[PDB]
Amino acid sequence: NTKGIDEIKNLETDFNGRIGVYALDTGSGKSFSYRANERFPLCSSFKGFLAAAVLKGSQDNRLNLNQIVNYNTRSLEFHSPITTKYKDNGMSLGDMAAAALQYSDNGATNIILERYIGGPEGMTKFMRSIGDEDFRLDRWELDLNTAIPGDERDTSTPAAVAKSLKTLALGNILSEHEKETYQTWLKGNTTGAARIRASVPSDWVVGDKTGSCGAYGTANDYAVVWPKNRAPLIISVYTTKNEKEAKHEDKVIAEASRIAIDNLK
Ligand SMILES: *C(=O)[C@@H]([C@@H]1N[C@@H](C(=O)O)C(C)(C)S1)C(C)(C)O
């Protein structure tokens, strides 16, 4: 059978859940897919796209990344490591957008969704405008993390996630300068050491955004991977389980990425 398909099937069987993967080599055009068209919860992964929406607004001159966002009288959401630190005097919209991505900051995420993106509807609308028919954000943080089997709320497909990431990071939606900023933000992510980053050799450069729902063993990661002396790779790995109390498995996500990279065709 086709390279790596059985291996990913076996990984999935051992994991006892559902694994969805889509990897693309932008240099050769080769790819690897497994349940790439199935829905999986986005969890915090959508924040990487929220950052891109902010960048598009900047480019459109509908907003300015230098604008100081004040929230000294707003209580911050669970897991707001950066916004909590700067709550007294606020932070630029640019720094807040970066924090939402790099630290999965929930305060930054909800503040930006409210004041600049138009909430879940606006986020969904932005993705629709770039060609993504699958992505759907329906709830705010941290309600969007339920990850209930069969529930289509706050889900997307590994393929759609990959298509959108390539469109944003390597397409022409964002201008050259905004893409540089987006790629820089992705490269500075602090939460993906055990996922896609763990599947590639040390000299490859990774830019990613992880997502961990904390329910139904749901976790994911997507990334732009720059191999030494090669064109970028777009990797999208999403996983889920049927037990509500099951824990996520970083090793499984990493192995699915390794398999995909090694089996492009
Ligand atoms: C999103 O899934 C989650 C935050 N992001 C994950 C991750 O990126 O792996 C953390 C474990 C860092 S916390 C919540 C807190 C649900 O928004």
Q: What is the amino acid identity at position 222?
A: Y
d(CA 35, CA 258): 16
177 backbone dihedrals φ, ψ, rounded to 5° = -65, -45
Q: Under a CB-based contact definition with an 8 Å cutoff, are residues 216 and 149 in contact?
A: yes
Query: What dihedral do alpha carbons 142, 147, 152, 158 form, nearest 10°?
Result: 100
The domains of the chain, with CATH numbers, are: 1-265 (3.40.710.10)
d(CA 128, CA 118): 14
Q: What is the amino acid identity at position 239?
A: T
Q: Under a CB-based contact definition with an 8 Å cutoff, are residues 140 and 110 in contact?
A: yes
Respond yes or no on whether the N-terminal peptide bond of residue 144 is cis (omega within 30° of 0): no
The per-residue b/e assignment along 136-156, b for 16 or more CB within 10 angstroms, e otherwise, is: bbbebbbebbbbeeeeebbbb
Parallel, antiparallel, or unpaired: how do β-strands 219-226 and 205-212 relate? antiparallel
Q: DSSP letters of 217-253?
A: T-EEEEEEEE-TTS--EEEEEEEE-S-TTPPP-HHHH
Which value in Å is the resolution of this experimental model?
A: 1.9
Please work out whether the CB of residue 141 comes within 6 Å of at least one atom of ligand 1: yes
Distance 236 CA to ligand 1 centre (A): 17
d(CA 183, CA 165): 10
For the chain, report the end-to-end CA distance as a whole number of angstroms. Answer: 13
> Which residues face 21 on adjacent strands?
34, 237
Residues 6+ apart with CB under 8 A from 216: 41, 147, 148, 149, 240, 241, 242, 243, 244, 246
Q: Ligand 1: which of 49, 212, 221, 253 to mutate, judged by most atoms within 8 Å of the beta carbon?
A: 212
Residues 6+ apart with CB under 8 A from 200: 206, 225, 227, 257, 258, 261
Q: Under a CB-based contact definition with an 8 Å cutoff, are residues 124 and 164 in contact?
A: no
What was the experiment behind these coordinates? X-ray
- 44: annotated active-site residue: yes
Q: Which two tokens stand for residue 40?
A: 């999986």
Q: Which two tokens stand for residue 186?
A: 């992705």
d(CA 138, CA 163): 20
Sheet arrangement for strand 219-226? 31-34, 18-25, 233-240, 219-226, 205-212
CA 149 to chain CA mean position, Å: 20
Tokens 């004041």 -> residue = 115
Q: What's the sign of the alpha-carbon dihedral 28, 31, 37, 39? A: negative
Distance 43 CA to ligand 1 centre (A): 7
> Which residues face 68 on adjacent strands?
92
Please work out whether the CB of residue 187 comes within 6 Å of at least one atom of ligand 1: no
